[PDB]
Write a protein that binds this DNA or RNA. Structure first.
Ligand code: MG
Ligand code: MG
Ligand code: MG
Ligand code: MG
Ligand code: MG
Ligand code: MG
Ligand code: MG
Ligand code: MG
Ligand code: MG
Ligand code: MG
Ligand code: MG
Ligand code: MG
Lengths: 374, 325, 98, 120
RNA sequence: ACCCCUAUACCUUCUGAUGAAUUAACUAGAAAUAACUUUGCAAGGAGAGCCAAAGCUAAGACCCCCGAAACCAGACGA
RNA sequence: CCGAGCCUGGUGAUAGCUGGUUGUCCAAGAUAGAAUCUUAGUUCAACUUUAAAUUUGCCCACAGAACCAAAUCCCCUUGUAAAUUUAACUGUUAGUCCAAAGAGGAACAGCUCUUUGGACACUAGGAAAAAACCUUGUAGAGAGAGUAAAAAAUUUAACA
RNA sequence: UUAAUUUAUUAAUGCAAACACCUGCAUUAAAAAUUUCGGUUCGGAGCAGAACCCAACCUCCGAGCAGUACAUGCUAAGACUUCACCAGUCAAAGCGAACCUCAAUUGAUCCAAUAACUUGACGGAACAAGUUACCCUAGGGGCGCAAUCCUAUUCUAGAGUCCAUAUCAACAAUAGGGUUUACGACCUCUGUUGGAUCAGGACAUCCCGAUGGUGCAGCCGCUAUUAAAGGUUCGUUUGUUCAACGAUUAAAGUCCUACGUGAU
RNA sequence: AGAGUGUAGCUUAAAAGCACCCAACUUACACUUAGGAGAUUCAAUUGACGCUCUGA
């Protein structure tokens, strides 16, 4: 269990605070935590929100316990680093890290583009140096180019959404970030497409891989019921409105009707959101074209579950750990089956315990996805 | 996976609970001394060396130091003369053997001539090359003398009373390597009189080839308990002079140990060519000291983005032309 | 970025050995470097890596302050890249017998 | 998972009761051994099939022989379950070139010095 | 001669059931680009061109049969 | 023959659909993955097989191969004979069954679905009949002989 | 067809052309024509007094700048290559030297200009409804009885705390419903808001009971605990559980029960 | 009276290195530069001279 990992009294007390949601480590968490505590550079594909972040952090906390504070001198960079592909995912990771580090001595910080660089490069942010830092690649690259941060001081690196970090837009900035090569590297994801894994082999030397659940196409969660849309797109939104009418029943019983809508395009998301807000639906939309402060407020509201209907662009498909996720509608089916499965795993992120509803609309480009639906 | 250190990791024990209680390298010389102490160790994570590499006398010295301090006082310090002649004489008397062994190891004389087995020379021997009348050129361990000044046989001094002096060039000139060219052979020398002993090989001048770098010629005297027979008369033959000192020391110098050595450098000069023409009766060879040539890159079909120098690498030179006149 | 040539591979002089931003790779024997903080070959031979203690130049004052901040029993150590020359510098060949 | 499987060394550990029951002695071993097939090449390991191929056992119910070296011993013990060996004795001397023709094999172990045409 | 003993009618999808009463006649592989092999010539080959940093010309070899309902023009039908 | 008249030409129309596709004799030669408006087809993929050019392979013994059971891989000798690059076409890929290992469903099923080993879609003898169990492998004739696997076993309630 | 798209063609206009007719161009329709109906904004001081941060349609100064430059040397191996070149880059050895001010003064991609350099307000697939219970070819699979359901249940084996018989119940068994399957072809070619009704449950009590404090003298209150035993109205507008209106009440509390209850 | 005994303060040194202090730069500390002061307790592997502990 968790006690097999040798958790510190702060770590054990925080794990006890995580009860009844944590009474023992998950089997994937059991496979991941002490091997990371063995310091081995590895990559783990598992269920999203399955405590894998906690499994990575506990071994990271143990490794940081073995690290001296003398490397924490002013002006240098952190030794414990984490990467996220979205500012929302990085913010959620920083919020999770700040709870565990309240009873610990690790300083937790977040870095992303589109925010106040004065606060990012602040004297108690950049110069005083922290133990735990989750950073977007753009802000980190800007800091390194402007010498606001360093890369020789790192000792433990974590790559959250590493498959998403392996994006063609995201690979170059990561390689630019790639720097002491002897640091312990751990990557976390939901699944590993093969063409990116060998890319990891570009910078790998005898690593390890930890896979969870079925080794095949693990498309269907046993706790998630799925349906196929046998209707054209033209009334499908109306059918979604009918589903909203069905969600009206979900609005009636108090069983939580937090609905997350998958939209492929930010402008299409805006048009659909204008239609839904016209349709008297309490909808909030988050996208890559949204304002950064507006996106931050919407993310805080969704964390508080303030908007029972929320639309999300390609910026917000995967990695979500949202409490009370009971309604998930792929208003646009994801262009990748991996993306569709990741959006599916974003809901019901409390684990195998919290249930939810999943409905996906079907369009003509997604016709070939019907074989993917098989 | 994760490779940690095989041996003890650096900076592991000195951490402790109280890091601020450490003494810390306040002086940069202290950190340098600690680093040098660590570097003296061979370690377990490999390195560049892995791939490349009496009481009465003390009381008398204390009294002498006290007398020197009293004579100085302080006032002489505030710039002592300290003549180097008496210091050098006392160093040759007291601690000359370790420095002599170090110099012999540095020159590779024991490793080449004696095939190893370096020894500290007890007898301090210095040579005096006759250059006119006054003065005589002093030859210590490593003192360089040109072949022009070394035409005649030099004198030697060791301040000792049998002995056997020999001279060998460890450079292996003319013939094959791992050999030394003998130049002189004095044997059964009674007392300090080197002329008392017989002369088997008469003294020949140095003959270093042109452009062959520097040559190493060493003159050695060994402590002889009993006189022994030898064997080659005054000859200019190079085959008779070719002999290794290790073989002579092994199976012939059984009751004999080394006493003193003096090393010298030898280079090509006018007297070397004169000895080659007249005495050796042969043409003097000249060496080139040539470095390896460029590898030259791989030739492709098109020069790509490179400048005009791509198509002109792997032949020669300056005026060649087209099909045919 | 990273190490262009692995250790032990024969490489000509001037070939790119190891390129890095923030000096993860340090210089050993016969390892040139310019303003780009990258390691390159300075001689033909075999490359090797060695964990040897790094002592900064006296010109670097911040590095001197950091080394002073290091304890008296603290040893830094650093991975330097030595280039052992396989070929010799040159050989003397008999030109002529005049 | 069927495989070329491990068998104990005690299978090749004889007993004095066994050496009495067999015709063998602990000292002075045999100089050459003989072998034969009495089991199908089918229905065993294909590795063992090529092992019997290595044994020169493409015939069956026919005699063959080799020098019973420890390597040969291990090779035979690989395919022992299908094969049979014999103490290919020779009470007389080995066949000289003068006696190059008249030789044979009597199945109890005899190598004939001269298989003449008249009885005793 | 048979009664003696052995003896799951043929062609084919198959992984282990449709056709053929029986004759006799009809009835189903032709595109040479590349490469090869065999011949003639040779830094030129060939009866204007094409190609050649040993090639160029000549020949040789790979390409089924049956079977929809369709559709359009032009007629012809109360 | 009206659910869109009939006929001639266009029309050897078109579908990736079925079936059938003609005489002989020698050399080699049977089941792995991934895409696909695709599983009734095709393409990247492997094997081959052949033609040429270039010298060791298969069986193994020591060491070695990880933290969250069988084992397997790299692997000196032994015995035995083929192996590495360059090219052309085809051809399998929708395999069956059995012993072991897992997942699902009744822990029904000639049910499903992945790893290991065989044989099997290919001879002969035997189990009664014989696609799968045992023996056996590979060419013809003789009116010799040795041999292999080889037909089920079986019954009782005493007591001081 | 109000799927999509046209508009070859008409019919209108309008504009052209010529002096009511013809032709051309747009728009509109009618009618057509072509193609779809898928699978399993940014800073300085305070609020914010001593590492960060901190809030107000908070308290005051400010900013869309301005001024000043463009060894920042030469030579020279060996590498990267905008998938060609061009253009660009890295850099060892040598010669010749050392050894921007501001306080903020700003913003993002995208579409622009510009040959370019340059100048303008955190991931960006080419598109088409519904029917054929007429489509067409081609592929894939009453009467007889109760064998079945059948119930005034016998023997009581057995459960039922004991107790076969309060109740249930198996094996066989008196039998005989014409409502269910065929057997013979006997007369023949997961429904939905109120409301009506009935209401069940909770206290997180609107009132009543019992209290504690109270800015509780007393009457009225407020707060907090306990208490579901009980009720929590009638009508108007509007079909709306809400809302406005009047008479009220000690109170006109809230919800759940498929936002309770339509197999009427 | 017994045990342990012995290089300046320290040394699994055999007369060295860490340590001591002075100045100048230091508010001061530290560093550096210039300095010097510094010990195998004595007699033949043995004995006593000097100290700690256990006693009285
Ligand atoms: Mg690949
Ligand atoms: Mg697969
Ligand atoms: Mg490199
Ligand atoms: Mg036929
Ligand atoms: Mg028929
Ligand atoms: Mg037809
Ligand atoms: Mg026709
Ligand atoms: Mg046809
Ligand atoms: Mg077809
Ligand atoms: Mg596709
Ligand atoms: Mg498609
Ligand atoms: Mg298809």
């Amino acid at each position: 269990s968790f006690a097999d990992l040798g958790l510190e009294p702060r770590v054990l007390h925080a794990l006890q605070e995580a009860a009844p949601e944590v009474v023992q480590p998950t089997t994937v968490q059991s496979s991941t935590i002490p091997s990371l505590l063995r310091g081995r550079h590895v990559v783990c594909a598992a269920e999203t929100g399955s405590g894998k972040t906690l499994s990575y952090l506990l071994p990271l906390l143990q490794r940081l316990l073995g690290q001296p504070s003398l490397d924490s001198l002013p002006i240098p960079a952190p030794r414990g680093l984490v990467l996220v592909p979205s500012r929302e995912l990085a913010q959620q990771v920083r919020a999770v890290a700040q709870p565990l580090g309240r009873s610990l001595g690790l300083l937790v910080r977040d870095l992303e583009g589109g925010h106040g660089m004065r606060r990012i490069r602040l004297q108690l942010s950049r110069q005083p140096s922290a133990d735990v830092l989750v950073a977007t690649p753009g802000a980190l690259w800007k800091a390194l180019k402007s010498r606001l941060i360093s890369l020789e001081q790192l000792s433990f690196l974590v790559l959250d959404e590493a498959d998403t970090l392996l994006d063609e837009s995201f690979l170059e900035l990561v390689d630019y970030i790639l720097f002491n090569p002897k640091a312990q590297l751990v990557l976390v994801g939901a699944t590993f497409p093969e063409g990116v894994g060998q890319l990891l082999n570009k910078v790998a030397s005898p690593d390890a891989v930890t896979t969870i659940t079925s080794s095949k196409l693990h498309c269907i969660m046993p706790h998630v019921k799925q349906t196929f849309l046998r209707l054209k797109g033209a009334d499908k939104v109306a059918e979604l409105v009918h589903i909203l009418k069905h969600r009206d029943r979900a609005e009636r019983t108090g069983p939580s009707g937090t609905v997350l809508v998958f939209c492929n395009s930010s402008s299409t998301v805006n048009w659909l959101g204008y239609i839904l807000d016209d349709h008297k639906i309490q909808h909030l939309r988050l996208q890559g074209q949204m304002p950064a402060l507006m996106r931050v407020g919407i993310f805080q509201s969704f964390q508080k579950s303030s908007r029972d209907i929320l639309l999300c662009t390609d910026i917000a498909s995967r990695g979500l750990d949202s409490t009370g996720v009971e309604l998930v509608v792929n208003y646009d089916f994801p262009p990748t089956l991996q993306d569709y499965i990741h959006r599916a795993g974003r809901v019901g992120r409390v684990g195998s315990e919290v249930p939810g509803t999943v409905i996906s609309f079907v369009t003509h480009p997604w016709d070939v996805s019907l074989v993917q639906k098989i | 996976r994760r490779t940690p250190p095989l041996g003890p990791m650096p900076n592991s024990d000195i951490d402790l609970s109280n890091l601020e209680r450490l003494e810390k390298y306040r002086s940069f010389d202290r950190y340098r001394r600690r680093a040098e102490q660590e570097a003296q160790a061979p370690h377990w994570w490999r390195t560049y060396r892995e791939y490349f590499g009496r009481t009465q006398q003390l009381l008398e010295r204390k009294q002498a130091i006290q007398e020197l301090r009293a004579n100085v006082e302080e006032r002489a310090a505030r710039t002592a003369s300290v003549p180097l002649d008496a210091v050098r004489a006392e160093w040759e008397r007291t601690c000359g053997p370790y420095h002599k062994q170090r110099l012999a190891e540095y020159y590779g004389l024991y490793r080449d001539l004696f095939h190893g087995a370096t020894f500290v020379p007890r007898v301090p021997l210095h040579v005096a090359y006759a250059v006119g009348e006054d003065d005589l050129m002093p030859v210590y361990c490593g003192n360089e003398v040109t072949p022009t000044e070394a035409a005649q046989a030099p004198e030697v001094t060791y301040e000792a009373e049998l002995w056997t002096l020999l001279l060998t060039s460890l450079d292996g000139h003319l013939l094959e390597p791992d050999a030394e060219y003998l130049h002189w052979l004095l044997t059964n020398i009674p007392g300090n009189r080197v002329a008392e002993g017989q002369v088997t090989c008469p003294y020949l001048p140095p003959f270093p080839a042109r452009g062959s770098g520097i040559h190493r010629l060493a003159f050695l005297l060994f402590k002889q308990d009993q006189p022994i027979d030898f064997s080659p008369s005054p000859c200019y033959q190079l085959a008779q002079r070719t002999f290794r000192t290790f073989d002579f020391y092994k199976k012939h110098q059984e009751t004999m140990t080394p006493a003193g050595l003096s090393f010298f450098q030898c280079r090509w000069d006018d007297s070397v060519t004169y000895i080659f023409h007249q005495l050796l009766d042969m043409r003097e060879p000249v060496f080139e000291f040539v470095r390896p040539p460029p590898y030259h890159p791989k030739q492709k079909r098109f020069p790509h983005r490179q400048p005009l120098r791509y198509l002109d690498r792997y032949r020669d030179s300056h005026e060649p032309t087209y099909g045919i006149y | 970025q990273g190490i262009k040539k692995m250790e032990g591979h024969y490489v000509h002089a001037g070939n790119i050995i190891a390129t890095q931003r923030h000096f993860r790779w340090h210089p050993g024997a016969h390892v040139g470097v310019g303003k780009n903080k990258c390691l390159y070959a300075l001689e033909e031979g075999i490359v090797r890596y060695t964990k040897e203690v790094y002592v900064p130049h006296p010109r670097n004052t911040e590095a001197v302050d950091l080394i002073t901040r290091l304890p008296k029993g603290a040893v830094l150590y650093k991975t330097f890249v030595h280039v052992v020359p396989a070929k010799p510098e040159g050989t003397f060949k008999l030109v002529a017998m005049l | 998972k069927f495989t070329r499987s491990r068998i104990p060394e005690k299978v090749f550990q004889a007993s004095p009761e066994d050496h009495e029951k067999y015709g063998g002695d602990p000292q002075n071993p045999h100089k050459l051994h003989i072998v034969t097939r009495i089991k199908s090449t089918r229905r065993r390991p294909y590795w063992e099939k090529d092992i019997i191929k290595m044994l020169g056992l493409e015939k069956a119910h026919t005699p063959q022989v080799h020098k019973n070296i420890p390597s040969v011993n291990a090779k035979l013990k690989v395919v022992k379950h299908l094969i049979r060996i014999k103490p290919l004795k020779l009470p007389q001397g080995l066949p000289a070139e003068e006696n190059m023709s008249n030789t044979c094999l009597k199945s109890t172990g005899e190598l004939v010095v001269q298989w003449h045409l008249k009885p005793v």
